[PDB]
Amino acid sequence: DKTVRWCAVSEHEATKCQSFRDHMKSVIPSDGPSVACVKKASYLDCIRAIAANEADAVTLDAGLVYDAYLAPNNLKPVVAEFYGSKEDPQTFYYAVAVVKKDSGFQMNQLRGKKSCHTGLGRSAGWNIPIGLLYCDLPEPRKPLEKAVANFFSGSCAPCADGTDFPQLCQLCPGCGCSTLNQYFGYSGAFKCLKDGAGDVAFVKHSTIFENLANKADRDQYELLCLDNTRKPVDEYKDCHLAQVPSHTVVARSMGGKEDLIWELLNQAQEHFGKDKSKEFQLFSSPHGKDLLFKDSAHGFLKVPPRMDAKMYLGYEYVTAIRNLREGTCPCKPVKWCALSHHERLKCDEWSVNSVGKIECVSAETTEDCIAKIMNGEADAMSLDGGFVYIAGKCGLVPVLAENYNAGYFAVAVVKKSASDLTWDNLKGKKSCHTAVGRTAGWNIPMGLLYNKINHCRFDEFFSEGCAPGSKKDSSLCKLCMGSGLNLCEPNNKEGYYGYTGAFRCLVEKGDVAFVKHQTVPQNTGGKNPDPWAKNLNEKDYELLCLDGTRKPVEEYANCHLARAPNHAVVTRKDKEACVHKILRQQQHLFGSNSETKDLLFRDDTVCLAKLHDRNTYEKYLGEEYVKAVGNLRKCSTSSLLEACTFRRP
Ligand SMILES: O=C(O)CN(CC(=O)O)CC(=O)O
Ligand SMILES: [Os+3]
Ligand SMILES: [Os+3]
Ligand SMILES: [Os+3]
Ligand SMILES: [Os+3]
Ligand SMILES: [Os+3]
Ligand SMILES: [Ti+4]
């Protein structure tokens, strides 16, 4: 058997699950998955049951998704309910802080204001705002209501203990926890702001649109962003307190059975989903409310496999609820993340030389590092421009740029003896790329190529090549050099990976190499002692210009594909100022006055440059870079980018 043991927290849910199980037997063959129904007393008991391998799946609210993640449960979200349109699936809501336009305060100025909450104990209206504000609350913070009552000068916190903490009901006397209170619920908390009772309303992103029809009235309101900035109310995706998943199915991190659960649920919706009008409806409960799933759901989406719980809830949500659960308050040391075995050792030397200012965490992949920076396990790392795009679309920001002397020049290099080649026709040639999705060796060359050919299936534009990161069966892996499972992989164990590796690929197999303007000079004329490069002469290679002509290697300024953005340090926005200081101070002490090659920082970097103007990824990379990368995503799967595109399309 291959059965999904579904968990029920009530006797009505168990009856739903049993009807579920029986109706599935009629639409799924013997080859497919079955339902079994485990009934426990509570969602926590279900979580412990799934972790103890006594059940397989349950669907939880976000707060319980957090509890399911913690040790020793270690559950992960696998399937998400969506709501509204099939064309526009709404999987998350946004907790926001609405304010009146031109009221003159930011998130870090909330103390002493007047607040409107949807209700004590609710997510958007209490748990998230108070969780994020927890360390700003006066001491003692137990009980929590007393601390909030001594933070906001007066509030409307429905369901709060107004007898003991009357400040919490100054704007709705009695703190009535019923719609009899005009300022209760999601509309009421907003009305508390509209009517002028309060200064800020902690609500969901859609309340403002549900209670104000005209946009003219909606331009009188703004949102507080966590960076102490405001934005308009329809920019909640860039100015919220937390992005919360509505209702998501969790499963064991190892031991699945994610594959089975999705197959079961996906076929369940195709047969008993919304508007299928069978005798059994998946999202209906003839007796009860929201049994197994929210009755308002319209279907299920499969959660991308890269996604863990901290990443799916988001950094701000996890921060807020962790503050509520544990209640621990203190630039700190900067946790730099490293990759290879050789790269972590350089960081250790840096850490002891920094005297505590720098610490070191490590991962196996750049994407694993990027993930650790999102959820707080790490703070900063230096990234290729293509990874800055990934990191930016995951909410990270560039802080400093590595300067090598505006940016460097991306070039296309050919062997001069082949005077046949020209930029105007490389169809059916042999290409050598640094890796897939990188600035010099992919995003700039293949971005330009997309405009002439109108697709990103470069496997059938070139004859063959080596572009590490491609699928191992691809023609763009046939010229690669790594052996075993190292063939075509984007790491050091593939000899044609990187700036120099791509050049070596041109020297030994390829017709054209896409690199940076320093590559060919750095590896010719005996400068590179390796046997493959020791006897090469820079004069034997030329650059392909956009003209259609060719020019010598040293004349890259007038024979360049484009100007490339240099590698940059990325971190999350709440650490931008701190990394900006500690690093620029470490740079003034260990700067322009690695053992292997290109460890932690590129080895041709003079200093880490101030940014100011270009402090976001679209501003740093540029309009045409992000536009080109947008086309190239149609043919390239970065599983980390797939997870971040699930939260922020
Ligand atoms: O809790 C119960 O079991 C009672 N039922 C109503 C009934 O069975 O008449 C309420 C309900 O579950 O909606
Ligand atoms: Os009943
Ligand atoms: Os080694
Ligand atoms: Os693979
Ligand atoms: Os592989
Ligand atoms: Os130019
Ligand atoms: Ti690069």
Swiss-Prot record:
The modification Phosphoserine is found at residues 362, 636. It comes from Homo sapiens (Human). InterPro entries: Serotransferrin_mammal, Transferrin, Transferrin-like_dom, Transferrin_Fe_BS. Residues 4-326, 334-634 form the Transferrin-like domain. Transferrins are iron binding transport proteins which can bind two Fe(3+) ions in association with the binding of an anion, usually bicarbonate. It is responsible for the transport of iron from sites of absorption and heme degradation to those of storage and utilization. Serum transferrin may also have a further role in stimulating cell proliferation. (Microbial infection) Serves as an iron source for Neisseria species, which capture the protein and extract its iron for their own use. The keyword NAD does not apply. Hydrogencarbonate 2 binds at residues 434, 438, 440-441. Expressed by the liver and secreted in plasma. Has a bilobed structure, each lobe binds a single Fe(3+) ion. Does not always bind 2 Fe(3+) ions. Fe(3+) 2 binds at residues 384, 408, 499, 567. It is found in: Secreted. Belongs to the transferrin family. One of its GO terms (cellular component) is recycling endosome. Gene3D superfamilies: Periplasmic binding protein-like II (3.40.190.10). This is Serotransferrin.
